[PDB]
Structure formats: C-alpha cells, structure tokens
DNA sequence: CCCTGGAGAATCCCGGTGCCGAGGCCGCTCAATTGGTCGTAGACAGCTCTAGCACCGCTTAAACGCACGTACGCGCTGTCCCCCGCGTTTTAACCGCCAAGGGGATTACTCCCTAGTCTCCAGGCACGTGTCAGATATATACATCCTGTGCA
DNA sequence: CACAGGATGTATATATCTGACACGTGCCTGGAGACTAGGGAGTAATCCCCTTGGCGGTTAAAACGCGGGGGACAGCGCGTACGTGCGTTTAAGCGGTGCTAGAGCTGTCTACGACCAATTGAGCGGCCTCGGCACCGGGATTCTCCAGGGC
C-alpha cells in the first residue's frame, strides 16, 4: 500500500545526483586514520599536513571513479547490468596493474 | 612579511579580462590555472632541451620551441599556437 | 587488563561510501563482493603513493609530509594533480 | 640620457612575463644557452593556451548562471573538447567532478 | 530593600539574598555591569529571579531579557521561574531544526514573552534571531565558558547589542588574570581595556570591590565541619621506573612527553606491551607494579573496617577502567561515572549510590564530567588518584561530596609521585590556588 | 583422408609462433605502407632500412599486445572468438 | 599510392593473432586491425618526420623512430 | 712528478667507468655541480642491474643449450622475473617474442 | 675522418665474464644492453636533478642518487642496489 | 564400452658449411694528477605557530541492521550459419646483382649572437579593506513515476 | 492494454547574510639599458656511402573454393541476491581545556669540496684476421590425435 519505487529508479536518481556534485564522498576522519596507519609501516612519528590528506583523498576518489567506469564497461560487455570482482580484475589487468 | 612567492595569477587575470570582460575567478581555479601553466612550461622546456641534446647543440631557440609545440600539442591547437608564436617573434624582432 | 579494538581502518571505508563512488562512476547494480576488492585496490594505491611521498619527505630531511610531496609522488606515478601546487 | 624602459612583453604585445620566462628557462637547467626568441615564443604559446581554456571556462560558467569560474567549470571546459582532453588526459582537477554520462543500456525501457 | 518583595511565592528571601538584591539594584542604578560570585549553594538563581521580578514589578520596565544557562540547567531554571515568580513570562528554546523553527515562529517573532532561556549551542544556532531584538539585561550562568577570547561564544555574545549585563560564576579566576580581564572586558568594554601591598593586592581589591560580590559559605549555616587534606607520597614500582627512564630518554610512537610521564605516574599497563603475555590475568599483577595501587589496596579495606564510602576522582577513563578491573578482582561493588555514561544511566547511578542503604563502596568519577550537580553528601572519603592543573577543578571535585547534607568531617587524600611531573603539577596547582585566594578571598 | 578437427591446428600454430621470434608481416608491403603514410606529411622522403625495421618491430609488438587483451575480453564475455567490439573495449580501457 | 593497406594480409593478421594467443577469429576483425595499425603508424611517422624536419635532413633514421616511440611511451631496445 | 695514474673505477672496485659517468653527468644538464660520490654510486647501481640481467639471461640460455645470449634469451629473462618485468614494463625488446601462455579455456576438453 | 662512437660494450662484456665465465653475447644483445644502460642512466639522473630542483640545491650528491634509486627501482632490487652503492662509496672514500 | 591402429607431427642424433664473435694491434683523445679559489652548503641560534594527546559536552546526519519482493544472473536447449582445415592455382615476395646519384657527414672560416656587469627603476609582491556574488532557506509550482482501472 | 490521478522529487523565484574577491598603497628586487668579449653556429665546399631504381629466376605464400562441425545467439525457466524503505544506533563534526615542547623558517658565519686550468700517458675505439658455434639438411625415434566395440 505505501508508495514504492521500482528497483532501479532511485539508482538512476543517485547516479544523476552524484554526477552533478563535486564533493568528497569518503569520510574525512576515517580516511585520515587509514592514511596514518599506512604511514606507520613506512616510518614512525610521521606528521601529515591537513592539505596532504585532502590531496590523497582527491587522488584516491578520482582513481576509484575511473576504475568504476571501466568496470561498468566490462560488465556491459559481459551482457550484464551488475558489476563484479571479475570486471574489476579485468579492468586492472587491461590497464596494467 | 613572508617570503615572496611567484605565480602567474595576474597574467591569468589579464587574459581573463581580455576574453570575458565581466567575469571573475575563484582562488582554487587560479591555483589550477597556475599549475596548468607550470606543467605546460615544463613539458615544452623538456622537449626543447632533448631536441637540442639530440642535435648536439647548447642553445635553445625559437626553432626548438616550435618543434616542441608541434610534438606536444594536438593538431589544430599546435598550428594555432605556431601561428601565435611566429606573430609574436616577428613583432619582437621588427620592433626592437 | 581490559581493552578492546573498535574496527579496522579499511572498514572505515564504508559500503554506502563505495556505493556513492560507484553512483558517480555510473553503476546501477553492485554485487556484495565488490567492497572487499575496492578496499584492496584502494589500499594498494595508497601504499604506493604514501611510500613515494615518505621518500620525498625523508630526502628533504623533514618530519611532516606535505601536499607538494603528495603532488610530486602523483606526478611520478603518472596522475598529475592540479590545485595543490 | 637613459631611454624609458619597456617590457619585452609590451614589445611583443603579449600579456605574459617574457623576462620571467627567460629567467626560469636559464635557471631550469634545460640548456646552457637560451635564445632571445625562445621566451617570446613560449610566452605567446602559454598565452594562447590560457586564452582557449578560459574562453571555454567562461562559456561554461555563463550558461550555469554564474559570474565566477570554479573548478567544476574548468573540468567541464577541459572535457567536452577533444584536443584539450588529449592534452590534459592524465590530469586530475581537484573539486572538478565528472561529466554527466549514463550508458544507454542502463536507461529504463 | 531589607525585606522580600510581594511578588515572591512560596518562601521569603533571607539576609544574604536580600543584600545581594540590594547590591544588584545599586549596581544597576549607578549603571555598571557586575559579577555575582556567591559560590554554588547560595541561591544565585533565586537572586536573579528576584532581580528580574523587581525589574518587571517595581518599575514598569519589562523587556526582552536573555538568560544563558548550560543545557543541563534549563529545566531547573524554568521550574524555578514558574514556581517562585509566576508573574513574569518565560520561554525556553530547545530542539532540532523543525522544533526550533516552530518555536521561533510561534513565540519569538510575536514577542509576547519577556525573558528567554537558551543554551550556548542554541545561541550559536539562533544568533540570527537572537541578534535582532534589543536586550536590556543579559544574564550568563557559569561565566567561565566565555573566559577565553577568540572563542565563538564569547565573540557572539560580545556582538549582541545589550543595555546591561550581569555575570554569574563561582570561580572567576582559575589560571591567570587574562580570563578575569576577559570577563571584565565583556562587561565594560571601555572601562577595562589594555592589559591588567602597594603594587598588587590592594590595587586589585580597590578596583574590583565595586564590580564583584563573593560570599564564602561560612556566614550562612555555620555547619559542615571543615575538610582534612592529607598528601600521600608514593615511590612507584620498578616497572614504572623502567618506563619513566625509557620515556625520558626517548619501537613505539610517543609524542606528548608530558602526557606520557603523566599516565606513567598512573599505571604502566596503559602503554602497549607493558602487560604480560597472552595469559592476560587480572590477579595481583596490577597492584604490585603500581605504588598508587599498592597504597589504595592498603587503604580501602581499612576504610571498610571503618566508615568506608569512598570517592575516587581520576583524570583518565582508562585509569578508571583499570580501577574497575581491580574492584572486580577484589570483589568490590562499585559505580562508575564518566563522560561515556548516558545521561539516564548517570542519574539512577547517583540515586542508587546515595540511597539510604547501599552496598556500593567505591564511586569512580572523572574530575571533569557532570558538573554542579551530583550531591554525594553521604560519601565520606575523597581520594584523588591524579591532580589536574586547575586547583579549583580539584576543589570542585572535593566539594561534590562536601555539601550541606553531610554531617561528619571529610578527608581528602592526594597522591603524589615524587621526582616526576606530578610534583610540577601540584606546585602549579598550589600556586594558582594561592593566587586565587589572595585576589578574591579577601 | 585424414582431417584434423577444427582447432587443433590453431593450437599448433599458437605454440609454434609463440616459440618463434621472427617478423610476421611481409617486409615489402610494410615498406610500401610506411612510405604511403609518410607521403601525406612531407614529400621526397627517404628512409633508412633500420627505420623501417624498427617501425615493423614496434607495430608487431603493439598488435600482439592488443590481441592478447582482446582475447582476454572475449574470454570474459564467455566466448572463444575475438570480435571488433572486443578490440574496441580493449582500446577504450587502455586509453585510446 | 593507394590501397597499400590491403598489403597487410589476412594470413599476417592471423599470424599476429596466433602469437597473441587467440584461437577463433571473426571475419570483421581484419578491417579493424588495419585501421588500428594505420592510426598507430600515422602517429609514429608524424613524430618521426617532425624530428627529421627539425634535423634539416631528408632521411628518416632509426634514431628518429626510437625518439618518437619513446616520447609516445613505447621505448624500443635494439636500434640505438 | 706524479704517481702512476690510478682509475677511479679501480679505486672503487667497479667495472663501469666512473670517469665517463662523471663526464656524462657534467655535460647532461642535470645540475650546476656534481659531487664526487655520485658517479661512484651510479656506476655501482648500473653494474648491479647489468649483472642481474646477464645472470638471468645466461641461466635461460643454458636452459636452451646455447653459449651466446640472444635477444630471445634477454626477453625470457626479463619477462620471467617480476621486479625486472615491472622495471621494463613499458619497453619492447627487438626480436624477443613473447612468453608461451595459452588460456586454460582454450585447451581441449 | 669519421668520428668515434662511445658504448658500454666492453664493460658489459667484463661483467658478463665475471658472472658467467664461458658465456658469450651477440651484437643484437649488445645493442639491447647498451640501450638499457643508457635508459637507466637517464631515468636515475633525471630523478636526481628533479630532486635537486625541488629542494633548491645546485649539486647532485650520493644522497640524491640513493633517493632516486629508492623512487625508481622496486623493492628487493632497490635494497640490493643501495647496498652496492653504499659499499662502493665507502671503498672510494677509504682508498682515495 | 573406452581402448588399438594408423598417420602426422614433434623429437633426437650426426655430419658439413658459413660467418660472425673473440682476440690482437695502433694511435689518440679523454681521464688522472696538481695547484689555486670561492661560493655553496653546513652548523648554529632565535622565534613563531602549528600540531599532537588525553579528555568533556552536544547535535545530528549518516551508518547499520532488517524484512520483502522483484528483476536479474545463470544454467540448459536448439539451430544454423559462420568459421576452419585442406587442396589448387596464382602472385608477388625474396634474393642476388648492377648502376647512379642524392645526401649525409666532415672541415675550415668567420661573425653575430649570447653571456656577464653595473646601474636604475618600475612592475609585481604582501598587507589591509569593504562590498557584492553565491549559498541557504522557504514556500511555491511543476514534472515524473507508479498503480488501479476500464478495456477483457 | 491506454489512461487518469495521486504521491513524490525537483526546478524556480525571492529574500538574507557573509566571507572572499577585487581594489588600493607602499616598498623592493628583479628586469631593462648599455656595453664588451668570446665561441657556437651558419655557410661554403668536398667526399663517399647508402638509398633507390630496375631486372631475372625460384618458391614460398596468398587467394579461392569446398564441405562439415561446433560455437554464437536467441529463447525459457528459476530461485537468489540486491534494491528499497523503515527503525535504531553510532560516531562524525563542531566547539571547548590544558600546558607544552617540536618542527619549520630565517639569518650569519665559516670551511671544504667542486670548478677551472695545464700536462701527460694509457684506456679505448676502430681495423684486420681467424676458428668454432650456429645453421641447415638428413635419417631414425617418441608423442599425440582421430576414427571405431557406434573397432
Ligand atoms: N529557597 C531556598 N532558600 C535558601 N537556600 C536554598 C533554597 N533552596 C535551596 N537552597 C540551598 O542552596 C543550595 C544549592 O543552591 P543553588 O541550587 O545554587 O540555589 P539557586 O538554584 O537558588 O541558585 C542547596 O544546598 C540548598 O540548601
């Protein structure tokens, strides 16, 4: 009885909304904690400027978006609509990683 | 009085005023433009230096700049930039 | 002796966040196994970049990683970043 | 007496610092000797490229109902143009976003 | 005005509040803004209610008045407003976006109200609406919140256009004269500018006597026998010496040397790797390698064989967790109060501890949690595991138990680790206490 | 009359060609192609033999790598036959 | 000078595909392969001829080809 | 007079020319000044890389039952080692062929 | 008269004889190895020059070479190369 | 039946040729040795401002968990056509040789361009400062999707 | 199967506010004007090599056609895993304390390492020459694939 959208309308709406914006989609403090933890292995007592974590987040988000674009192309090639780890691995293999 | 930092901001602003009179620009956009100018400068200078090295010359000249422009820029942009550079060099060498 | 851990930092990269990144990428349906793979690839990319940046910071004999160091590392990797220097 | 100084940028009619370009070329370790026309040519090329990108950015800002250029407008201008996309293909623009692009198969029908 | 007015309901004002009201009236008539520092437990809210009721009744001058209180006291302030002087009209602003919008559109714009009660966060959110009107009296409770410049609340409260002002606090001086200057500069921007016996003491008393009123809780009740402060020194254990020397000289990340020596004086197990292996037993391991734990383990059973009912104030929730483990090992029932304890859980814990017949022995409190509540009058002994840089904060923790309901004298044991940073900390605290005493107490 | 099934000879040729190391394009046709392409840019162009040989080496390596990626795409799509859409997908993911 | 792309023959494309490791080939892939080779060669030869014109020479050299390939990101070992 | 000339290569115990490396650094437009230890360090690194590649190529050629190393052996050695392959990932070796691999889905059922 | 061309051929031959004593090398492999040495030299020297420019110092030193090697070579290769270079620097300092 | 028999392809073992890698020899140009110089970087010292670490209070958006149903991924079938293996004819590659000339490579000379110095001064930085362009909120009005309903 | 209406998301004006952009001012340091000296390159001329053009014979490779099997593609069913909406929970984000040293930045002094020049002699590149590895051909073996007990 309550109104309900079909499975895929909200997905397209979100696609348009997040292709309209320019914000950062990852959480700032969790990303900073991840960066600090990774830096711990390479060297201890390292300090990060607040701009360094921002630049890292920018580069990471851009890389992930491009990877997802190639992954979607592979999934469409496979006569699918859903992306899968197979698509991610194929994209990485073709791009040379 | 912090130490002086050099940037192409004022020249970008003058080009912006020539192209679009009633328009402005934000700080991050000016940072992006400065980075773009620096990157293009580095590419052109590096290619010109390698051209001079291959030809075994110690001088970088307008010919090297023209060949670097041809090698780096894509096509229509390359030919338009070549025209611009030739115009500027002719004006400079005919005036003073 | 009484303490506990909260959560691994790679799990701070959440499923809704990965889904938002996929929505920007142009993806409609996502499998449930995508999140672990995305975490792995993010970890590898971050490791490479942070290693290069730490190398630059050590060469400068500094103890703080700088935005310029991150930009230099990205340029070495082939991912030039405009807007930070 | 001493004649009035004129900038080489004014001599070439450019809006870019020919003197600063010459200094950067000499201090950049590209060659030991630098010609006189090289800074003029390079300044002209930089000015042309900046003019092109700013033309496109102002066009993209005007039809978004704004008077300021923002990195979103810069990204929209850099993309949607083939030659500039080739030039800046491996370049990430901060706070730029991505183009609106939805594949046809994903469209409902 | 030696007698209580006629608008007061359910009770006549006593001598201290009537003379405080007279002081406030004289201050307003002369045209200065002042600080009321009658200490917690002398009816400051009642004096403020009497002042506002007098302003509304005796002179036909009611208008927009703002009373800034901490969120934890909004209900008590509103209840006192509606119980003592019902003639005045009062509202309170609280809630999320939709509730705040509904309330402002309902009452704040029409302005039938006269006195508004708001919290600091609501003030920051609602600066746009609270700014527009004119305020003839701005009352701020717990004025130590705006003691620091460059703070958003202090900037916003200075930005408002008010005819008069009035501060309510208990400890105007805590660390320096700069905070007292900040309060006085907010009150009188022109009178107090620049920067703040013959060269001291006398000048301070002469300048600040007409701008302040301080009352020690001694001339009102003449009861509540005084405290007894005992300082217990501890020579901490061998593992503590080893870690202390290692930290002083310098593969574990370590940045804040002062805050590493601090916990090192509290308990070495807080560091990673100082604990034994994967047995992770909790029996006599902790007591022996911590001298403060040794002294506590020797002292508490003696109190239990006697009056017991001890309070332990600590500066680290991790230390409180270790103490909870120790209490479980000793089969001691307890109750833990902390910033992480949900507000509903706090009140029932306080009431259970303060119930007439409770088995609870040890109450663990972080010194900076709660505040101006928590009437543990039935408690007997106060034990400070660590001492902070604020002697007044330590004294507030001490006087949480030292309340009007207590009938027997209380003893406060202060633990100090010699030849450590604890010595500096206690020296700084004593110096600040002496400065506050010599400035305000006389 | 003996006749192999359709695909054993393909695997045989795969093995022999992956084991060999010579060029798989006829040199005179490749040279004619190179000269015809070069005529558009500048006329009266002469080539060294080393230049044409290096061009052939690079072209063959590029095509071999492209074909390997195309085969991977065809396998991803649950196929054994390679197709132009596979080639296009490989180029698009590579960045061309 | 025309039609020379057809000199790149179907057996040769098949040999390259076999060295790549493919088993079955569709009939429409030969045209696409010819187009891909054409664009690759056009880029490389454009860069090489530009180097030659800078050198004020009428002969293209293996060094010019190697420099062109290197600046396209496809370094070659074995010719200088 | 002067003592008998002793090479910097023999002083450092290397087989690569420290003097030639120093000259190339000076004439290569890399910096205004070049230190003494930099040629030695670079020569050692170049020698180590050459030794690693040659050892792998010699092992491969001994597998093939030859004495002379050829580009095929060099390609085999480079592509069969992960770190060298990553170093030379975007390099083509002339007349080297490819590593023999056949996808398992193409093998007969 | 004709000019002379420099190469690393004799040094590659010496290293080869040191590693595999009775193993030879052909002309094509020699050209490949010479190109490889030149490419590694170019990469490391360029990285060191960029480091010197970033830190605003006019000299290229052993520290900068070591940092460039860390940036360029992956992992175990980097560690062993750094060890070899440090050993050579110590021997050169001691025996000079 | 899964398991022999042909039949083709790969594999291994010898023997004769060819040319190309390895060694030896000459001259010369580049690297080593010495001596003098100076500017670059190291060492040190003073200062300021971010930054880290342990906590409190509050608000609120975002994350987490859950239940249901629906497109969708995935397996299985059938068909037919398109690709592959094979034989035959045809074509142009390949190799060898010869002949000619354009053009790359070198050398010597000369000048004109660029580097280097000293003044001189104005363009380009930093530092304040105010006003408008974009963000936010809010109430509208409008467009999109979904489902029940006559069609059955 | 169209259609209409309802519920929801989204675009649109309009008013408020604020902090960041654009301007102006003052100072200084880096670019311009004038000049002189030295060597890098432009120019002319010569040499010889390496590219191009052509011709003939051999043969491998390509083009063409044929017949058959297997793989691509469309269709059908299913049952499962993901999207959607709702309710609870958590932690992010913001705003505070509390003293701290720490790290980056700038200014000065001073010594040593890199440059620069002259001299010389010994590695090193080019040129011959020769023998042993790789190549090629040929003959005798193992391996494997495909048809048939539907061998
Ligand atoms: N009506 C009253 N008159 C006098 N003293 C009171 C009254 N109500 C409470 N108190 C005392 O004041 C103490 C707490 O004071 P506080 O709550 O600060 O007063 P107020 O809320 O009026 O400022 C309590 O211990 C109590 O004994």
Numbering used by the authors:
A (entry chain A): 37 to 133
B (entry chain H), I (entry chain D): 27 to 122
C (entry chain B): 17 to 101
D (entry chain G), H (entry chain C): 10 to 118
E (entry chain W): 168 to 363, 377 to 430, 443 to 634
F (entry chain E): 38 to 133
G (entry chain F): 22 to 101
Please share text taken word for word from the publication where this structure appeared.
All known remodeler enzymes use an Snf2-type ATPase motor to slide nucleosomal DNA around the histone octamer, but the precise underlying mechanism is unclear. Here, we use cryo-electron microscopy (cryo-EM) to visualize the continuous motion of nucleosomal DNA induced by human chromatin remodeler SNF2H, an ISWI family member. We merged the datasets from all conditions and performed extensive data analyses to determine 13 unique structures of the active SNF2H bound to the nucleosome. Based on the conformations of DNA at SHL2 and of SNF2H, we clustered our 13 structures into five groups (A to E).
